[PDB]
Amino acid sequence: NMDVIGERIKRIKEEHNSTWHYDDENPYKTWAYHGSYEVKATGSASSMINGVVKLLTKPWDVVPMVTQMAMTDTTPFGQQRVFKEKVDTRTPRPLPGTRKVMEITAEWLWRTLGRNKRPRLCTREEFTKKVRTNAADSAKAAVEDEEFWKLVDRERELHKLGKCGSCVYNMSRAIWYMWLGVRYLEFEALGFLNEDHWFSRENSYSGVEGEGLHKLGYILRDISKIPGGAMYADDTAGWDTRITEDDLHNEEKIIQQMDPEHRQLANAIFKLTYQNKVVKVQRPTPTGTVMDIISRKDQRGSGQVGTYGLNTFTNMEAQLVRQMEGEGVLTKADLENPHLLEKKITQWLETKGVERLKRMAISGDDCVVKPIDDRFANALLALNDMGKVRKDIPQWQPSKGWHDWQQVPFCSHHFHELIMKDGRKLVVPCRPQDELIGRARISQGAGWSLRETACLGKAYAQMWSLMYFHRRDLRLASNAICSAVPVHWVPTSRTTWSIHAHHQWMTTEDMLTVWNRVWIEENPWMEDKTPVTTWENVPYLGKREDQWCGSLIGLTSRATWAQNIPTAIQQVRSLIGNEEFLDYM
Numbered sequence: 001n002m003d004v005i006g007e008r009i010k011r012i013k014e015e016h017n018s019t020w021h022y023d024d025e026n027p028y029k030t031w032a033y034h035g036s037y038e039v040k041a042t043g044s045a046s047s048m049i050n051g052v053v054k055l056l057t058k059p060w061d062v063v064p065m066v067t068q069m070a071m072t073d074t075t076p077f078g079q080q081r082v083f084k085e086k087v088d089t090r091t092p093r094p095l096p097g098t099r100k101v102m103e104i105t106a107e108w109l110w111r112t113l114g115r116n117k118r119p120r121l122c123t124r125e126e127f128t129k130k131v132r133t134n135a136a137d138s139a140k141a142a143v144e145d146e147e148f149w150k151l152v153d154r155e156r157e158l159h160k161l162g163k164c165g166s167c168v169y170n171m172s173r174a175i176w177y178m179w180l181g182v183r184y185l186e187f188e189a190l191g192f193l194n195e196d197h198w199f200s201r202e203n204s205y206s207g208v209e210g211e212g213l214h215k216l217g218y219i220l221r222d223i224s225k226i227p228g229g230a231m232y233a234d235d236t237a238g239w240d241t242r243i244t245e246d247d248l249h250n251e252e253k254i255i256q257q258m259d260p261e262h263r264q265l266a267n268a269i270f271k272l273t274y275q276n277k278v279v280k281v282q283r284p285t286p287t288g289t290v291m292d293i294i295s296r297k298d299q300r301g302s303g304q305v306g307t308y309g310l311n312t313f314t315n316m317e318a319q320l321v322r323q324m325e326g327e328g329v330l331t332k333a334d335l336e337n338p339h340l341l342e343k344k345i346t347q348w349l350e351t352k353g354v355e356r357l358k359r360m361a362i363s364g365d366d367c368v369v370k371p372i373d374d375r376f377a378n379a380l381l382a383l384n385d386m387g388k389v390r391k392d393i394p395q396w397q398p399s400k401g402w403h404d405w406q407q408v409p410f411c412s413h414h415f416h417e418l419i420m421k422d423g424r425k426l427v428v429p430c431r432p433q434d435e436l437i438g439r440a441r442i443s444q445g446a447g448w449s450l451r452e453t454a455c456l457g458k459a460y461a462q463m464w465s466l467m468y469f470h471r472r473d474l475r476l477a478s479n480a481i482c483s484a485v486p487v488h489w490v491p492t493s494r495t496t497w498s499i500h501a502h503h504q505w506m507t508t509e510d511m512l513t514v515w516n517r518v519w520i521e522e523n524p525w526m527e528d529k530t531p532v533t534t535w536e537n538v539p540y541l542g543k544r545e546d547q548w549c550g551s552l553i554g555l556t557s558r559a560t561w562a563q564n565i566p567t568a569i570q571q572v573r574s575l576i577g578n579e580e581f582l583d584y585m
């Protein structure tokens with residue numbers, strides 16, 4: 001294995017020869033450990049609290065989920081704990097018949113996905129524009145430096161020779177340039193999957209890339225109209241650790257559709273940074289803190305460009321295989337058989353494949369499947385054998401599905417159908433309210449001015465106005481935050497890193513105008529384009545649903561907070577200063 005990874009380790013070893021040593025009491029069991037070198041401590045045990053959001057959400061100061069979110073450990077100790085728990089494991093190799101089905105399905109899926117689109121290389125300009133339209137942080141300075149792009153060209157020439165010298169994944173500027181350059185080369189070779197929307201619903205059938213959170217519920221409601229069994233949404237226990245060498249080799253088949261110059265670079269990303277990988281992980285010792293150099297041939301690097309798309313691909317393939325087992329196409333004897341007949345798999349794929357893909361909503365490891373019947377609930381042989389073991393359930397206990405799409409969990413949410421005062425229907429995203437409030441109360445980093453903190457606060461408030469307006473407490477707290485923050489102050493920093501976030505709340509435009517654009521004008525499931533002229537006509541969940549989903553409506557502490565919220569708004573106002581504020585209450 002040293003012929004592929006040796007150069008990268010040699011360069012780390014050379015760079016850190018001052019403190020480089022082999023810690024013989026290292027905790028790696030399934031990863032090959034190469035050595036250590038001393039580093040400064042990165043991360044924190046707790047998270048900085050957004051005082052603006054906190055002062056305007058007093059009843060949630062006494063809420064356990066809100067307190068838990070205010071924690072989250074990113075120190076070398078925190079990193080080591082998460083590593084041991086999941087990452088340091090081995091997935092048993094799938095059986096020979098399972099490997100054949102996965103190969104037949106992967107080949108058919110890649111051909112289906114590339115029926116209209118052709119792969120292509122992504123550029124320095126695309127990457128620069130992406131970095132720019134995200135921060136405008138030290139990545140923008142690096143992208144502006146010509147010396148970064150020269151290092152990129154040097155690394156690419158090694159990749160063309162089938163070599164890698166600096167592409168290392170992490171769990172002053174020379175080390176940083178090497179990381180961003182690794183991500184650029186990965187983006188250059190595999191970025192087309194995201195950039196050219198290979199996993200859009202129109203292109204992939206099961207996919208939901210570019211749809212946006214506000215569309216996911218409508219998609220789940222459309223799947224519910226398809227005749228079949230219940231809707232299943234099984235969670236995989238640590239999906240990224242379950243990506244096998246067989247999965248990686250199946251994912252690689254995309255290179256067959258590429259032009260020779262693209263194929264050469266994509267093949268280099270697959271063979272050198274995916275199928276072999278060099279990882280840096282911080283670890284505390286009695287002497288201090290060290291950085292460990294580890295390596296392995298399988299699993300997915302969570303912080304990579306191709307991760308989302310390739311997890312989407314493999315999950316689409318895995319669910320088609322589970323659907324085949326459910327229908328009796330794949331038996332236990334077939335999975336164990338190294339000479340398994342290809343015919344019935346190819347026949348099922350060519351005659352039913354696309355119809356079966358349409359029964360699904362797949363976003364990375366998140367899946368919703370509506371099979372032709374409930375035999376799927378007990379079709380677990382191929383699923384477990386592929387290594388996609390369901391989280392917190394005995395291996396062979398049947399899956400529990402849902403007969404109401406509104407109960408189905410997907411992408412950390414569930415979705416409610418609301419009836420507006422004018423009879424029109426809305427399909428809205430929802431989650432336990434404590435998770436929404438707990439997240440908004442967290443500020444990202446330290447040394448942030450009251451202005452920066454208030455603007456992130458405003459971003460969270462406006463996200464609630466657009467997506468979670470149907471939650472009584474969130475519309476009230478959103479109106480309170482927007483009344484306490486100067487009107488002309490632009491929301492800064494992101495509220496989420498989710499692929500489903502389109503960030504329509506990152507504006508000073510009127511939120512009711514934005515609401516109308518998203519939910520009425522641009523909404524394809526809204527036949528009647530009549531605008532809503534008042535927030536009084538923007539619906540809420542039924543009181544009982546709002547309460548079931550965590551609302552404090554009906555409690556005295558909540559009624560007191562609502563009554564006294566202008567006092568809190570005024571206190572935030574007096575601390576911000578003499579600025580232009582607008583009263584949304």
Ligand SMILES: COc1ccc(CC(=O)O)cc1-c1ccccc1
Binds near residue numbers: 413495496500
């Ligand atoms: C499926 O969408 C999401 C999934 C998870 C999270 C949580 C997080 O990332 O902090 C947020 C969103 C989200 C929220 C509003 C608008 C669009 C996306």
Ligand SMILES: [Zn+2]
Binds near residue numbers: 155159163165166167
């Ligand atoms: Zn490299």
Ligand SMILES: [Zn+2]
Binds near residue numbers: 414545
């Ligand atoms: Zn809900």
